[PDB]
Design a protein around this ligand. Structure first.
Ligand SMILES: *[C@H](O)[C@H](C[C@@H]1CCNC1=O)NC(=O)[C@@H]1[C@@H]2[C@H](CN1C(=O)COc1ccc(Cl)cc1Cl)C2(C)C
Ligand SMILES: *[C@H](O)[C@H](C[C@@H]1CCNC1=O)NC(=O)[C@@H]1[C@@H]2[C@H](CN1C(=O)COc1ccc(Cl)cc1Cl)C2(C)C
Lengths: 306, 306
């Protein structure tokens, strides 16, 4: 037993990370087959990153302007092109470490592992959720652009995120691996802001089920509630509405614990109105919302990946 | 910016994990050079694990009783020996993936990354602290024994932990890689219990400095305190005593923020006596104690590993 914010093993992704330097900008790239993927603002400079015109900037570039460091070995760039907000640098060598992979775009509420990287070298790994406002609460410093987020499903890495920027509230924004931003953000230095977030209701319920599975039961009660009456409380506390599909997705957790989904909602209702009163749930004094039902089933059952 | 519970990249360790099966017990082993390391209770059975005599049990074993699966390839065991609570299985093949490594024993209060494994296959990675009572609050199910904890320091993996068991409170106990248990636990099924824990004071202060670096400042104050008067409050709230060396270790964080260590103690004192009053620190409603000063400096500065 026990319950931890757990990332996927990062080894398959570590073998794809490279360093991309252009001008005085160094960031990370993702090397799959004979392509290196990286944020397009690597082609920018100081006075560029204001309201840049990346098509103009890119046509002024040459293959040899892009220095690609795969560890202690330089990769020759033989072509370049822009795809939305990412660059695709064609290199003369296919990555012999290329795992089988997919480029997937995730939904707010879903989670993924981030391999934070600097100068092409992995620094750490942690779990993030896509917030309802399409930001992520990460840990990113200068030089971390091009770090990717991913999930693993048996032997296949599903890349879902490339890091591009921090917003003024300290949260982070980036793209899918096709270069399309999550949320209404642009890779310019403007006065853009996150905008209002909500709590991921279905995830909080999943985490409550994780707690019960692990022996935290004090928040349970004989009360129940209808979906509609629960959702008026959710709205009041800036929680996302709970749909019937969310109830369906929680079914296996409900069946394992023997606590009906709607009964757990009644428990969440009471926690929202009364707080916790000095008690904790799974070592937390806050209702946690960055674990999906899948995450709970995976950890409380022990799935692996080859 | 941002602050996350961050593990080390796990790739170097993933290449060492194997499956060890003996009788009807399957667990994980750690394959370094031509030795596989695993918990010695793999040689036990159901009626064995009560008050077993492992020397007697081991002399009754044969090299061929140990099935070692390195992925889809079987490793021939050519020798075996017991070292305290671990087995060393000599195999005919050296692991060509062996990273440079060390076997180190850590102190309570220090942190490490755990690569949770089942059937020799990595499942996830997360950060743990050695509690003052020599347990760890992990996430471990049946089959996870032999998963290791580790730190990475440039290119070198310092293995500090092998998993053996869960205690009745849901916390976890294991050994260093020389097979010596952390704390007063034995690899028998007895009525052993964790015993009383304390909060790691120096780590809480480090995390408060992490908060300030990341813009959470509401808990700061003009008050100060002496080390002695702080330590009477620490004792009252079941916090570990703060030593002058702890103050020294916090020096760089103090110097970066411009908040004297003893002034941050005064802030912790007030948080201990008043609570947080509905506010959070780094997304937590509890004082967090599983980040060392090193962890904070590493994350709030961006060190990597090759
Ligand atoms: C690429 O390595 C960086 C990663 C940034 C640096 C600090 N934290 C990060 O995640 N990306 C950028 O520097 C991008 C780049 C231009 C601006 N930018 C930003 O991150 C915006 O800036 C900030 C905004 C808010 C904060 Cl709290 C901090 C910073 Cl540095 C492009 C937008 C072109
Ligand atoms: C080896 O894979 C397991 C790992 C255990 C299983 C559940 N969680 C874990 O970390 N190790 C064991 O089964 C060891 C083994 C005998 C008993 N044992 C225990 O973990 C003790 O048991 C438990 C105690 C408390 C709880 Cl809450 C659950 C269990 Cl299963 C040796 C002590 C020989």
């Amino acid at each position: 037993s026990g319950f931890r914010k757990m990332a996927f093993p990062s080894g398959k992704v570590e073998g794809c990370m490279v360093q991309v330097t252009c001008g005085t900008t160094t960031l990370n790239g993702l090397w799959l087959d004979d392509v290196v993927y990286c944020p397009r603002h690597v082609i920018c400079t100081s006075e560029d990153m204001l309201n840049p015109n990346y098509e103009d900037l890119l046509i002024r570039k040459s293959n040899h302007n892009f220095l690609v460091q795969a560890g202690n070995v330089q990769l020759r760039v033989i072509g370049h092109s822009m795809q939305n907000c990412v660059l695709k640098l064609k290199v003369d060598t296919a990555n012999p470490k290329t795992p089988k992979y997919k480029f997937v775009r995730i939904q707010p509420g879903q989670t993924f592992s981030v391999l934070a990287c600097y100068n092409g070298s992995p620094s750490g790994v942690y779990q993030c959720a896509m917030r309802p406002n399409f930001t992520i609460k990460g840990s990113f410093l200068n030089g971390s652009c091009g770090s990717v987020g991913f999930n693993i499903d048996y032997d296949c890495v599903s890349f879902c995120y490339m890091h591009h920027m921090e917003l003024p509230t300290g949260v982070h924004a980036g793209t899918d691996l096709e270069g399309n931003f999550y949320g209404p953000f642009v890779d310019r230095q403007t006065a853009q802001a996150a905008g209002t977030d909500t709590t991921i209701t279905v995830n909080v319920l999943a985490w409550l089920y994780a707690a019960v599975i692990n022996g935290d039961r004090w928040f349970l009660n004989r009360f129940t509630t209808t979906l509609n009456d629960f959702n008026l409380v959710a709205m009041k506390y800036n929680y996302e509405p709970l749909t019937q599909d969310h109830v369906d997705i929680l079914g296996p957790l409900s069946a394992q614990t023997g606590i009906a989904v709607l009964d757990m909602c009644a428990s969440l209702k009471e926690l929202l109105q009364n707080g916790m009163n000095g008690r904790t749930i799974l070592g937390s004094a806050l209702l946690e919302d960055e674990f999906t039902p899948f995450d709970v089933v995976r950890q409380c059952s022990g799935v692996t990946f080859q």
